[PDB]
Amino acid sequence: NSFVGLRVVAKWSSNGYFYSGKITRDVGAGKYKLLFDDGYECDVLGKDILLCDPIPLDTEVTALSEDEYFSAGVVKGHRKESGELYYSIEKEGQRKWYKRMAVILSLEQGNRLREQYGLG
């Protein structure tokens, strides 16, 4: 039905990476107001919004560490606990659980998902 309230992964224009958030308002003209999980609110073009919740198994993604580093990996698991989503990310034969908002997509990684999940 409506996109308002749905979780998405959407491009932050300042670095071109896609981050977890929610659509909070239809602002017309192919644009949506997003509330990112980190609290930032701004308008984003539909073409830069991916309607996936969760990011699907086997997707190539980027994971942010608690100490400001990023690395590429592949989604191999999901788990819900206390109303919060966690991703199992595989890198070089090993895995690590990350909170939802620490899993992001580079421009190339988000581009792969646009045809199937993009809103523009």
Partner: peptide, 10 residues
């Protein structure tokens, strides 16, 4: 009065 840090890039 606090603002989101992502506003620092605008």
């Amino acid at each position: 009065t606090s603002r989101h840090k992502k506003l620092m890039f605008k």
